[PDB]
Amino acid sequence: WQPPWYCKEPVRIGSCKKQFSSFYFKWTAKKCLPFLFSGCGGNANRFQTIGECRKKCLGK
Known about the structure:
Layout: E1 20-26, E2 31-37, H1 50-58
Antiparallel strand pairs: 1-2
């Protein structure tokens, strides 16, 4: 198994000024990890639930 491309993008908190609990795939550790998203200016390596992250990035 290899993850899709967006799971390999670096975590991006972005440029806005708020906080939203999120998950990203740290592909070098093959784990879905929590992070705080600012609310805009992110990238595609962001998921609302750890399950959605595992489904897309691990194929679970």
